[PDB]
Amino acid sequence: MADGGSERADGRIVKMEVDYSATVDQRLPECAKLAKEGRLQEVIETLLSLEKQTRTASDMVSTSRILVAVVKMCYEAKEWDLLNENIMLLSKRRSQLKQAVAKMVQQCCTYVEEITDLPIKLRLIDTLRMVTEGKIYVEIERARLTKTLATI
Amino acid sequence: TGYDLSASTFSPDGRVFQVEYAMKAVENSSTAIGIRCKDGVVFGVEKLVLSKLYEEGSNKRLFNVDRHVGMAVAGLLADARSLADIAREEASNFRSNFGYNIPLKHLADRVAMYVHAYTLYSAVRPFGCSFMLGSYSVNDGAQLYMIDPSGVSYGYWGCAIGKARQAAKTEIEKLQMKEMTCRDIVKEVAKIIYIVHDEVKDKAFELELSWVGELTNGRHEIVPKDIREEAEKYAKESLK
Amino acid sequence: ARPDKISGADINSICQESGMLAVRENRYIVLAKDFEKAYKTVIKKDEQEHEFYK
Amino acid sequence: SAGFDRHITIFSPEGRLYQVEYAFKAINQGGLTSVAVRGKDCAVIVTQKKVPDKLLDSSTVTHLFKITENIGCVMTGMTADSRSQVQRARYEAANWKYKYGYEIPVDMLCKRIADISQVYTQNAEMRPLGCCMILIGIDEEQGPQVYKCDPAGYYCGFKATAAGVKQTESTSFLEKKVKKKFDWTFEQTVETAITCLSTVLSIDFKPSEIEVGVVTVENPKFRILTEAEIDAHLVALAE
Amino acid sequence: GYSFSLTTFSPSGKLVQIEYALAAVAGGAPSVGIKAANGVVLATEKKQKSILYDERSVHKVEPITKHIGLVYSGMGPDYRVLVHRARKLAQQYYLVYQEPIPTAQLVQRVASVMQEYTQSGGVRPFGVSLLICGWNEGRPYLFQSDPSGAYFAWKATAMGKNYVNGKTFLEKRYNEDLELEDAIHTAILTLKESFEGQMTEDNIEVGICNEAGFRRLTPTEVKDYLAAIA
Amino acid sequence: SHEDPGNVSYSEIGGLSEQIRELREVIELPLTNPELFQRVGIIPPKGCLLYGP
Numbered sequence: 006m007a008d009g010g011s012e013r014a015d016g017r018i019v020k021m022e023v024d025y026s027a028t029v030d031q032r033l034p035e036c037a038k039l040a041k042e043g044r045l046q047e048v049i050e051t052l053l054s055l056e057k058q059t060r061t062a063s064d065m066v067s068t069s070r071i072l073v074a075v076v077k078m079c080y081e082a083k084e085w086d087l088l089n090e091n092i093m094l095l096s097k098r099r100s101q102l103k104q105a106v107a108k109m110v111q112q113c114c115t116y117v118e119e120i121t122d123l124p125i126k127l128r129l130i131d132t133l134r135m136v137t138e139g140k141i142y143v144e145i146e147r148a149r150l151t152k153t154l155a156t157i
Numbered sequence: 158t159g160y161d162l163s164a165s166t167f168s169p170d171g172r173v174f175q176v177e178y179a180m181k182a183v184e185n186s187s188t189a190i191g192i193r194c195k196d197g198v199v200f201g202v203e204k205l206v207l208s209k210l211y212e213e214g215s216n217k218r219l220f221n222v223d224r225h226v227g228m229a230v231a232g233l234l235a236d237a238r239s240l241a242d243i244a245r246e247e248a249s250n251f252r253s254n255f256g257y258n259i260p261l262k263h264l265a266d267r268v269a270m271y272v273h274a275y276t277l278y279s280a281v282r283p284f285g286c287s288f289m290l291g292s293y294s295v296n297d298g299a300q301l302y303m304i305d306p307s308g309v310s311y312g313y314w315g316c317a318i319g320k321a322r323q324a325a326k327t328e329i330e331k332l333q334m335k336e337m338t339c340r341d342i343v344k345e346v347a348k349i350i351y352i353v354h355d356e357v358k359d360k361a362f363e364l365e366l367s368w369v370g371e372l373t374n375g376r377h378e379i380v381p382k383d384i385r386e387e388a389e390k391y392a393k394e395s396l397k
Numbered sequence: 398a399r400p401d402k403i404s405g406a407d408i409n410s411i412c413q414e415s416g417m418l419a420v421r422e423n424r425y426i427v428l429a430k431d432f433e434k435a436y437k438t439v440i441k442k443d444e445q446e447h448e449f450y451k
Numbered sequence: 452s453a454g455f456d457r458h459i460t461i462f463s464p465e466g467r468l469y470q471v472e473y474a475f476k477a478i479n480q481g482g483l484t485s486v487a488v489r490g491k492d493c494a495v496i497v498t499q500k501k502v503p504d505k506l507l508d509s510s511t512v513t514h515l516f517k518i519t520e521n522i523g524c525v526m527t528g529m530t531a532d533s534r535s536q537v538q539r540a541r542y543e544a545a546n547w548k549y550k551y552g553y554e555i556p557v558d559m560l561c562k563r564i565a566d567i568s569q570v571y572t573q574n575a576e577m578r579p580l581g582c583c584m585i586l587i588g589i590d591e592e593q594g595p596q597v598y599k600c601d602p603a604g605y606y607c608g609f610k611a612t613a614a615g616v617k618q619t620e621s622t623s624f625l626e627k628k629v630k631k632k633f634d635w636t637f638e639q640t641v642e643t644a645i646t647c648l649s650t651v652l653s654i655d656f657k658p659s660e661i662e663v664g665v666v667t668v669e670n671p672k673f674r675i676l677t678e679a680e681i682d683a684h685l686v687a688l689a690e
Numbered sequence: 691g692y693s694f695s696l697t698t699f700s701p702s703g704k705l706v707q708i709e710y711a712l713a714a715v716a717g718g719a720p721s722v723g724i725k726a727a728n729g730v731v732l733a734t735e736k737k738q739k740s741i742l743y744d745e746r747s748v749h750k751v752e753p754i755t756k757h758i759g760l761v762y763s764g765m766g767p768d769y770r771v772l773v774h775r776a777r778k779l780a781q782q783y784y785l786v787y788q789e790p791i792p793t794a795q796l797v798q799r800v801a802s803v804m805q806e807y808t809q810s811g812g813v814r815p816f817g818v819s820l821l822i823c824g825w826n827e828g829r830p831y832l833f834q835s836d837p838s839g840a841y842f843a844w845k846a847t848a849m850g851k852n853y854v855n856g857k858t859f860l861e862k863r864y865n866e867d868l869e870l871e872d873a874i875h876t877a878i879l880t881l882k883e884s885f886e887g888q889m890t891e892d893n894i895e896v897g898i899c900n901e902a903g904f905r906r907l908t909p910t911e912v913k914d915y916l917a918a919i920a
Numbered sequence: 921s922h923e924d925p926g927n928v929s930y931s932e933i934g935g936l937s938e939q940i941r942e943l944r945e946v947i948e949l950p951l952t953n954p955e956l957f958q959r960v961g962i963i964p965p966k967g968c969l970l971y972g973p
């Protein structure tokens with residue numbers, strides 16, 4: 006519905022810094038309960054990608070504050086839920102994931118050179134699942150090209 | 158297009174054309190609708206005078222099967238009369254064998270089996286009728302069922318049988334049907350029947366309204382429509 | 398060594414079936430996949446239709 | 452071919468008859484899908500509803516017909532044949548209970564319904580009731596059963612069962628799914644039923660369209676599920 | 691475009707609606723049955739269409755009494771009907787005479803029933819050819835009937851697909867004098883000549899008739915026997 | 921022969937799931953390379969039948 010992303014994102018703009026790490030998994034069932042809906046065909050889609058943008062603002066926490074992207078098993082667990090609970094027929098809210106995973110390889114392209122190659126290569130083995138589930142539609146397979154380039 | 162002769166034979170694609178032709182036989186008949194409220198069921202039939210030869214009070218399609226059940230038939234009239242007699246007989250068997258009023262589900266299922274038994278064999282034709290069945294009970298509420306020429310019998314809140322089957326239920330469903338008592342629904346059915354076909358193809362029609370519910374204390378009878386005269390003083394206000 | 402009788406036109410259809418079925422995967426020769434795919438595609442299940450009256 | 456215009460039930464040349472194999476898609480004019488699954492000490496039926504109208508009810512569109520207190524069934528095909536077949540089934544179960552003193556096993560009922568269909572088929576001048584019937588039930592010393600009855604009178608019965616419109620595809624999934632030897636812990640059964648219909652039709656819809664009938668050897672009574680627990684199972688299989 | 695229906699003869703030939711039922715029998719599932727010196731062996735060919743079906747529900751080899759076996763090659767929905775008729779009829783004989791009915795008398799009465807359905811003119815014939823056997827009075831028997839009401843007596847025969855090919859193997863392989871096990875061996879040989887490639891403890895279904903009575907073997911002994919019997 | 925028009929897009933109505941890919945294999949790919957089928961030695965895919973509605 007066109008109210009859930011509104012309430013969640015717009016009233017939880019504060020809850021990334023003041024919270025340590027809890028509202029990530031405490032917006033996880035919130036993200037799933039909006040992810041099981043597709044009403045306005047761009048409202049739920051764009052607002053869930055804004056909750057994923059707040060998730061990428063917590064990627065600073067997940068790769069910097071806490072252990073170096075060990076919580077990506079929980080991340081691709083909630084994305085496992087969000088990508089196999091409401092199969093979508095490859096549609097209906099799905100193109101929120103293009104910017105989401107291009108933002109993931111954006112984050113990993115800005116995270117790869119300093120620390121190590123561990124969080125980016127765990128991201129590549131997650132997104133191999135996500136995008137061998139996905140298609141050859143937009144640049145995420147060109148992201149596969151540059152990511153097997155990274156594994157080289 | 159076949160193979161359309163017997164009611165026993167199938168088609169190369171698997172349906173009986175006799176039953177189809179009987180279904181669209183009722184399509185040419187007069188428009189008859191029905192709707193229930195939260196404490197009753199209201200019938201209404203668009204009935205037409207032939208030219209000037211009728212008597213305004215003959216051959217009323219609103220039948221009355223049991224003390225609390227009546228029909229709202231549309232289609233071939235004499236076949237509906239025979240079917241109404243069969244329904245009276247079945248309610249007679251139930252009243253004689255169990256000592257209380259027939260539940261409308263069981264009555265409708267027996268009648269559906271009877272119609273299906275006339276659709277099965279090759280000696281007989283399918284019925285050319287489609288009718289409505291209303292009831293009311295203190296422990297059951299209001300129940301409105303519906304029987305096609307084939308024999309598929311299940312339940313509705315509102316229905317329509319005739320030409321304007323779609324063209325009535327387009328605006329039947331915009332009624333706030335639960336929160337209304339049936340005394341509103343009387344003029345509602347009046348305005349719905351009055352909307353369809355004022356003068357275009359025919360010259361004149363005439364309204365009958367049947368009426369069952371809690372307000373009749375479990376009885377089923379025609380309204381005193383002349384009492385409160387609710388169609389015309391609102392029908393003339395429904396043209397604008 | 399298999400029964401379930403397969404005639405010469407049916408044999409050649411199996412071979413071309415399997416060869417096209419591997420080359421459309423951009424391969425060199427079948428690694429025994431498409432032979433058994435040609436069985437479980439070509440037989441082709443005694444029709445469907447009707448499994449009544451046998 | 453024909454030729455003979457298949458008007459009555461006779462034998463054509465080479466060598467089949469065409470009336471029953473036209474009756475086999477009188478199911479297909481129903482526009483409906485049914486799936487049965489037997490894994491373990493439970494048994495699950497799943498079947499959708501096609502209600503386009505808001506004026507039409509929802510309780511009396513149920514295809515799951517509780518035949519007796521331990522036997523449920525589901526019907527496809529045209530509705531009148533199905534309901535008449537259902538009252539014959541109820542009548543004959545009651546005849547068993549009168550004659551033999553105990554509750555009828557689900558096998559003899561399928562045999563009797565098939566034999567009635569054969570008598571309607573053997574002698575002409577009656578339409579052979581073009582509907583298909585799937586039965587379920589619990590038996591002592593045998594667990595649960597799932598059976599299918601044909602309009603032709605060919606009963607059989609087995610583990611994973613499907614009939615309707617799209618069930619070449621459903622049986623393709625049930626060959627591709629009942630080949631791994633895992634146990635079936637009742638929510639595996641419910642999950643496989645929901646997801647097999649959800650992969651054949653590919654809709655992934657509300658809990659208010661399908662009907663779920665279960666029977667279990669903990670409550671041998673036939674049982675029809677409510678919207679709440681159907682919703683609970685549907686989000687419980689949502690990963 | 692004639693014959694049509696069952697009431698009138700052809701210009702010169704025969705009853706085409708019986709000929710078509712015989713053709714529909716010949717288009718059916720194969721079977722084989724062999725009379726040996728001490729017993730009779732029956733064997734059918736029962737393929738499930740999918741991997742879903744169960745092999746414990748429907749049974750092809752079927753006893754009529756405790757000492758009379760009976761298989762078919764055709765349609766089960768008619769098979770069960772005339773099975774039930776033979777059941778009730780044999781029990782009527784055993785009511786009258788207090789003695790188990792001889793197999794010839796079964797074949798007489800079943801042939802009378804099938805003939806009565808071949809009589810005019812609204813009912814169709816059975817699409818079923820039987821293979822009746824039993825061990826009555828020492829000497830075992832083997833009786834084939836047909837949809838036309840006729841009946842025969844065989845030492846070994848077959849019915850279904852490739853009954854001609856199976857019969858040419860039966861004429862070559864079998865003889866008059868064997869025991870029941872060698873009869874089962876040549877029976878599974880002639881069914882394996884013509885059946886599909888996967889023949890297991892469930893695709894076939896074999897019952898025997900000792901002089902000690904009818905016996906319907908289990909998948910246990912079928913799997914023990916057909917564990918590469920040759 | 922050459923009254924034959926064309927569509928103003930690949931998606932003139934829709935539903936290009938197997939359409940693009942399998943029509944692409946049945947036409948365009950062995951015309952680009954016959955030697956792949958000459959690992960087997962057969963002519964190009966002998967053509968579907970667009971049936972249905």
Ligand SMILES: Nc1ncnc2c1ncn2[C@@H]1O[C@H](COP(=O)(O)OP(=O)(O)OP(O)(O)=S)[C@@H](O)[C@H]1O
Pocket residue numbers: 405406407409
């Ligand atoms: N002995 C064989 N060895 C290899 N391939 C064979 C053999 N016999 C037949 N074939 C194959 O099967 C085909 C047989 O010729 P066909 O074209 O099938 O004859 P046909 O005209 O189609 O059948 P009819 O009865 O003449 S209409 C050959 O072209 C081969 O592909």
